[PDB]
Amino acid sequence: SPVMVLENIEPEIVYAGYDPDTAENLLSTLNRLAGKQMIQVVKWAKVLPGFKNLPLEDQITLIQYSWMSLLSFALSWRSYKHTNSQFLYFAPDLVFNEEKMHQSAMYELCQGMHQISLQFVRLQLTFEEYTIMKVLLLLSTIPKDGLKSQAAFEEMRTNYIKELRKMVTKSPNNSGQSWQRFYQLTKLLDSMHDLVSDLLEFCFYTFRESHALKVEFPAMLVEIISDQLPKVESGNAKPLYFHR
């Protein structure tokens, strides 16, 4: 059972170190927060059953494709646990929602992330469900022509899907609606591809126009986006769906 291991290796909370109250300072602060969070994501994935055994090249590819889904999913969990999904709990010292956003695009991205959090309230998502779904998001995007150890990846992915299904369908808390719930969780994972697509498009823009927009990125994100952007731009990114 990886569930026991998953609870143990779960990263601890990181602070933003918030302040001038401008769009470029908010974005720069969020990006520097992402860099701190990325260190804890990599240490989490390093000791993850199955993933820990894939070639180094495949581990890098997977993290570079899914870093955004992992961070937005963890943000939705914190938002749910600490504010009942009224606000986006980026860090204990940086908590806000759409109402603080004046630019149309920024409001919609903020709202999209809030809508995932509200779906956690509707589902009353548990920590066990969350940790398995988080792993499934790390395994949600692959290169168009596959990975180095494609079969080993397919085995590990199918195993994590089965762990989610057995956990949901065997729980007495879901009696009479366990399959309906499993399909709601898999639909929520598919809908993560849509949200993440939008968060990545704005991220790629603020990255390319970083100097002009005065939007700062930490070294971790500079290196990740530098490798990810040419892969996404060239169509070398295959999102894996449950219902599509």
Partner: peptide, 12 residues
């Protein structure tokens, strides 16, 4: 040009 932060963290 050099080992990435992602690669160093995965191999440390």
């Amino acid at each position: 040009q050099q080992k990435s932060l992602l690669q160093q963290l995965l191999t440390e």
